[PDB]
Paper text:
For the soaking method, DzFer crystals grown from condition I were soaked for 1 min in the condition I solution supplemented with 20% glycerol and 100 mM AgNO3. On the basis of the X-ray crystallographic analysis, the refined structure of Ag+-DzFer showed that a total of 88 Ag+ ions were bound to the DzFer nanocage through metal-coordination bonds. The fold of one subunit in Ag+-DzFer was composed of an antiparallel four-helix bundle together with a tiny helix E located at the end of the DE loop, where five Ag+-binding sites were observed near the helix A, the BC loop, and the CD loop. In the Ag+ cocrystal structure of DzFer, two Ag+-binding sites (Ag1 and Ag2) were observed inside the three-fold channel, whereas the other three Ag+-binding sites (Ag3, Ag4, and Ag5) were observed at the outer surface groove of the Ag+-DzFer shell through metal-coordination bonds. Ag1 was ligated by the carboxylate groups of Glu130 residues at distances of 2.7 Å and three water molecules at distances of 2.3 Å. Ag2 was coordinated with the carboxylate groups of the Asp127 (at distances of 3.2 Å) and Glu130 (at distances of 2.9 Å) residues and three water molecules (at distances of 3.3 Å). In the Ag+-DzFer structure, although few studies regarding ferritin with structural data to support this, we observed an argentophilic interaction between Ag1 and Ag2 (the Ag-Ag distance of 2.5 Å), and they coordinated with the negatively charged residues Asp127 and Glu130 at the three-fold channel. Ag4 was ligated by the thiolate group of the Cys12 residue at a distance of 3.1 Å, the carboxylate group of the Asp122 residue at a distance of 2.7 Å, and one water molecule at a distance of 2.7 Å. At the site of Ag5, the Ag+ ion was coordinated with the thioether group of Met31 at a distance of 3.2 Å, the hydroxyl group of Ser35 at a distance of 3.8 Å, and one water molecule at a distance of 2.7 Å.
The majority of ferritins consist of 24 subunits assembled in a highly symmetric manner. They compose a spherical protein shell around a central cavity into which a ferric oxyhydroxide mineral core can be formed. As is well known, these subunits are reversibly assembled into a hollow nanocage with a diameter of ~12 nm and a 4-3-2 symmetrical architecture, resulting in six four-fold, eight three-fold and twelve two-fold channels.
Numbering used by the authors:
A (entry chain A), B (entry chain A), C (entry chain A), D (entry chain A): 1 to 169
The structure:
């Protein structure tokens, strides 16, 4: 009766908790991509920066869902952040493909989370997700898709090096 | 045929009119809380300011729904703004509890209003409500909930005085 | 022969990988402490901010070890970031105690890592750790210890609320 | 009894003298690399600038060890700065490989010098070396290693030309 929870279904709460984990996970994947591209034998500084920034943004995404959980009076429950699937992510194209797949996985998760909120008639949650995640995911996915297109266009070797400069700066 | 109304159902219009009254009412409650806390024998200036600001914001909420009504080509119809339930709101905790209850009542009303708009497939109204009210209500409720938590933590007497300073400044 | 690795023992590399995980873990603990203190029923904003900042700094610590790993030509290998031990961290004192314990655990780990580097005659690694971690840990631990002292001094209730204001601002 | 020497072993002094020569030598190598890349028939201005800067920095490294020698009350003793091993350093990759080898040779020398100081319990010398040389060497080596990686990635011809632009600016 002194708590803030209102119109916030347990499934949604749990879906937010899952999404928190997912965003941390994606953060972690990108951290790993970043460090891969900062290997002396890979040495793609643009990719490194790009994936670091993506890692940091994923962390922010997580945190904003954490906040949301608290703002709705849910209870954040953390789970392990699983290690990413690979220790080495290949070429920039390989990693961008993996990133695209991750973002699509995150995006589906968010869409599922939105479907949850819509199912439970939580329009504030829906709005939150739309406002902070959905278009962002769309943008990210489109952006990575274009990267893949240009990576392919640029080709291996020099093209990769030059394309890599074009990430960020 | 020269009017702007389009896709704006009479129930929604009426729901906006009810919500207008509700926001004015909440404004009025907060006005009363404010004046209570500015009694010489209550004299909690932070609460006074906080509730005045909440009153003014509720008024703005009302006005924005008035505007919306007109922008959608509905017709604003005012009702009495009922006096608040109490003339004296007790301690800061008591008033914060009452505020929490009011905000939850407003919030449910808004959620009902959004459900109305969703039922009548008025996505512009839905968006309006989400954009201007829902998250705001969530924020308000969470904020007041935290106040209650801290009021309890701080305890009566000195704690109330000190907590009161922490509202606003 | 085109790689940068020099004087960087496999044990050290592995110790850095462990330390990376540990810093991420500590980051994660602090994230959880932060969100605990942002519960509507806990609502200690200073603690929230303090633990968020500690989480972010732990992340930076991790990242700097990631960087170091790459700068020394080791290979970062991530592991799961385990969920923290608790879902709810108690009072600010309880959490500060837990933080103190975590920082001491991190600190011992770092000291072990430094002992590793010293054992393997990796003075650059030693210096790195001393330059970026050791004094920082000392500072953190002392700082948290003082917090605990003041939390105790301040007492539960009002004291906790007031002490909480004194974290950060 | 009016001199400053204290806790500065003759071997260390001699090791500093050797290191001075080594840094001058490395300076000289880089000078030669620089001039190679400024040949009209080589004409890689980025490499030229990069190696000039590396030459100048190596000179500064030498000078700082000279200073250190004097600050510790040792006696600087110069030896011939031997001419570099090659008159022509090949492609940018070839020279970067040679640079990597030189920096690793310098780095080992410094590590040996640090081991000397540690053996003789000269922590000020150890610190000096750690503070001014070790991490710098690590950085240099990693940097050159990445260059080699990117030179390889970029390939001969156009890639070399483009990679060359990416040194410095
Ligand atoms: Ag819900
Ligand atoms: Ag990384
Ligand atoms: Ag992203
Ligand atoms: Ag919306
Ligand atoms: Ag919407
Ligand atoms: Ag309608
Ligand atoms: Ag008033
Ligand atoms: Ag309000
Ligand atoms: Ag080592
Ligand atoms: Ag948090
Ligand atoms: Ag810390
Ligand atoms: Ag000595
Ligand atoms: Ag020259
Ligand atoms: Ag150098
Ligand atoms: Ag040191
Ligand atoms: Ag040291």
């Amino acid at each position: 009766m002194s708590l803030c929870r209102q119109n916030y279904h347990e499934e949604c709460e749990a879906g937010v908790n899952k999404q928190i984990n997912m965003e941390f996970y994606a953060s972690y994947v990108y951290m790993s991509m970043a460090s891969h591209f900062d290997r002396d034998d890979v040495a793609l500084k643009g990719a490194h920066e790009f994936f670091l920034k993506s890692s940091s943004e994923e962390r922010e995404h997580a945190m904003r869902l954490i906040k949301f959980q608290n703002q709705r009076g849910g209870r954040v429950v953390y789970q392990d952040i699983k290690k990413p699937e690979k220790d080495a992510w290949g070429t920039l194209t390989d990693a961008m493909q993996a990133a695209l797949d991750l973002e699509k996985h995150v995006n589906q998760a968010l869409l599922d989370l939105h479907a949850l909120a819509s199912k439970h008639n939580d329009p504030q949650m829906c709005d939150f997700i739309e406002n902070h995640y959905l278009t962002e995911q769309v943008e990210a996915i489109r952006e990575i898709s274009g990267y893949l297109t240009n990576l392919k266009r640029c080709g291996p070797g020099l093209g990769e090096f030059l394309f890599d400069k074009e990430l960020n700066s």
